[PDB]
């Protein structure tokens, strides 16, 4: 049976995308740029902070100095850190707390494999820290998803090989990272988005220990 579960944060345990979006929208409003809405925000997902800011600036064909670019980028982050102060256990996705409990009671290791620079803060605000055996530090990892490095790091940190593990992800890049680490992916969302070759559940309430076991036995 699998020995560990490697969780992404955004789209699996909670929604951080909301708070990035709010941070960019508030930034854009502050400097008088219109059009940073939830649809436009699709162009900012999975994209570097530099690239995102550049796209926002283009909406008003606004030009900045290097010093101003740096300040705006810092301001987005300040915005983000302010907006996540509101996170609480009420923000945990359905099924996830029960899944963590059941994993822990079955002595299955639990690790976070997230690019979030605020992972430990977020898990603490959601009162989940006690379930996690490790959090992979994205600062100590060389390449982002779809590279497998973060999932490898998360497995190793709990003393397992990725091939002994299940990875939970909602994104294409994350699923590919899990695949290339050697872990078994189980996606959450739509096969239209994530592919027909993996097991996908429509929402996180379907991530139960019983279901993970059945998927493992059937792989
Ligand atoms: Mg995700």
Swiss-Prot record:
It catalyses: beta-D-glucose 1-phosphate = beta-D-glucose 6-phosphate. It is found in: Cytoplasm. Induction: By maltose, trehalose and sucrose and repressed by glucose and lactose. Binds 1 magnesium ion per subunit. Its cofactor is Mg(2+). Mg(2+) binds at residues 8, 10, 170. The active site is at 8 (nucleophile), 10 (proton donor/acceptor). InterPro entries: B-phosphoglucomutase_hydrolase, Beta-PGM, Beta-PGM-like, HAD-like_sf, HAD-SF_hydro_IA, HAD_sf, PGP-like_dom2. The record marks 114, 145 as: Important for catalytic activity and assists the phosphoryl transfer reaction to Asp8 by balancing charge and orienting the reacting groups. The keyword Isomerase applies. Beta-D-glucose 6-phosphate binds at residues 10, 46-47, 49, 116-118. GO terms for molecular function: beta-phosphoglucomutase activity; magnesium ion binding. The keyword Oxidoreductase does not apply. Its main location: cytoplasm. Keywords: Carbohydrate metabolism, Cytoplasm, Isomerase, Magnesium, Metal-binding, Phosphoprotein. Its EC number is 5.4.2.6. One of its GO terms (biological process) is carbohydrate metabolic process. It comes from the Bacteria. PANTHER family: 6-PHOSPHOGLUCONATE PHOSPHATASE, HEXITOL PHOSPHATASE B. The catalysis proceeds via a phosphoenzyme formed by reaction of an active-site nucleophile with the cofactor glucose 1,6-diphosphate (G1,6-diP). The phosphorylated mutase binds either G1P or G6P and transfers the phosphoryl group to the C(6)OH or C(1)OH, respectively. Belongs to the HAD-like hydrolase superfamily. CbbY/CbbZ/Gph/YieH family. This is Beta-phosphoglucomutase. It comes from Lactococcus lactis subsp. lactis (strain IL1403) (Streptococcus lactis). The gene is pgmB.
